[PDB]
Amino acid sequence: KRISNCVADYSVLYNSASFSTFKCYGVSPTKLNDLCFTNVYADSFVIRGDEVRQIAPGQTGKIADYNYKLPDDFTGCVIAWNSNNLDSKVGGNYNYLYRLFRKSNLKPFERDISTEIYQAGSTPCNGVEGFNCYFPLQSYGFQPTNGVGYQPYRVVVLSFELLHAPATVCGPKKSTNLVKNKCVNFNFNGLTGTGVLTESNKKFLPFQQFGRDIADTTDAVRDPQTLEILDITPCSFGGVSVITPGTNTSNQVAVLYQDVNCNVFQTRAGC
């Protein structure tokens, strides 16, 4: 499962108070809501109660090395719970399968669906039944009357991706206090512009987000809070200037600003 263009809250995923096990490495579990990434990959599969210890970076056995290998740089987050009342039934529930035999090791995050009957001589015995040639995929032994170490546990792996893209799965920042009439910096999902936010008098059509001008500059944005149209105007205009009476006449000077709005006299040509 791939998560995209959706905001995610992980507080509801933790306050269930029904999961038996939770291992979540790489990122501190208390501070993963504010920190966000690009994509979230959800991998779901069933496993027995005695194999939940094998799912960890740096383990060797018969399930992890043949079905889903965990790399060293595993920032995924593993959640599992007991579901014996639904994943198993009387008379023998053998609907779920697993691979026990494999020719060699496999790369992490790789799926193996080859239904090729394995042998000690794996490479000659292909699709045929030969000496010591037994199908690598075998049935389970799920039963609702078992104990605790062999119950059907539903394991979900919530991994994260590190590549350049704007964060989609998790909202990098939440709604902050609204400030206007001051030169501030904003990131309204499409630009990082530094400027003031005045109250405009022009209404936008109810399908647009941004707004340009004759000079083709994004000077109008719609705030997604309660749909008010705010203009964008840069706060830094022009430069400074110095008035000097000259040599052998004075020592003091006057400072002039070109297009900056404010002893001090507000002239037409600035401050």
Partner: antibody
Framework: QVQLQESGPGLVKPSETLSLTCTVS??????????WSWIRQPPGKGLEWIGC???????NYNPSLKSRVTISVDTSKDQFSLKLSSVTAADTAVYYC????????????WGQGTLVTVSS | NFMLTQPHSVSESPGKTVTISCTGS????????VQWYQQRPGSAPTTVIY?????PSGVPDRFSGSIDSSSNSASLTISGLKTEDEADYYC?????????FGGGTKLTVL
């Protein structure tokens, strides 16, 4: 930062109702999605978990202490209290109200331990 | 019925390295997070390490924890013993909606 202060008497008789209230100053009980729990520790023995609570009605108790722990949260006074029933002479322990965020995690801030000695 | 087995007495000279175990009976240690607590006599306990491999801000780098899920024993390796380490050590688990603590290790050299 934030701190937790316990109150209530340090005394209770056998088969009596215990009333220990832990108050919080410098923070909000309801805000932050923050859990609350109580931990007792007998002198010379290990820590024992009593129960944990949310700012809503969600709660859970130790099966050794099940059907005896009654903990309630009042947001207006910004504190939480625990009520213990059928207390005995073996319940003499140092009670700590425990500030904890992660239910599988840790008690990051500990309040000072009030001494409870059951008076026969 | 899940408990944490912890040695009662652990005594080594200052300056060396020690290992404190925390063994689970039924549930595997890799199933749930394990938190260690270092408590002075007559005061509130303080978390010395959490999340089984990383250290809280304030404690030295000597407090290291390791997980050995094969033997179901959680290890806390402490190196370079000194005067103010002489305290009780407790390990925590969660089981399933029921927080379970450890027996308790007294770190007294003599």
């Amino acid at each position: 930062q934030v701190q937790l202060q316990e109150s209530g008497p340090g005394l209770v008789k056998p088969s009596e109702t215990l009333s220990l209230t832990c108050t919080v100053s410098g923070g909000s009980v309801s805000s932050g999605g923050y859990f609350w729990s109580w931990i007792r520790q007998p002198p010379g023995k290990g820590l024992e978990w009593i129960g944990c609570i949310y700012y809503s009605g969600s709660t859970n108790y130790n099966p050794s202490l099940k059907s005896r722990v009654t903990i309630s949260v009042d947001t207006s006074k910004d504190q939480f209290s625990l009520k213990l029933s059928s207390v005995t002479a073996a319940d003499t322990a140092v009670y700590y109200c425990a500030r904890q965020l992660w239910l599988r995690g840790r008690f990051d801030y500990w309040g000072q331990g009030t001494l409870v000695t059951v008076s026969s | 019925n899940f408990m944490l087995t912890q040695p009662h007495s652990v005594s080594e000279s200052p300056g060396k390295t020690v290992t404190i175990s925390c063994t689970g009976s039924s549930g595997s240690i890799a199933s749930n997070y394990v938190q260690w607590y270092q408590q002075r006599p007559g005061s509130a306990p303080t978390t010395v390490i959490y999340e089984d491999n990383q250290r809280p801000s304030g404690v030295p780098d000597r407090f290291s924890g390791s997980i050995d899920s094969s033997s179901n024993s959680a290890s806390l390796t402490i190196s370079g013993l000194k005067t103010e380490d002489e305290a009780d050590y407790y390990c925590q688990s969660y089981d399933s909606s029921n927080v379970v603590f450890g027996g308790g290790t007294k770190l007294t050299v003599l």
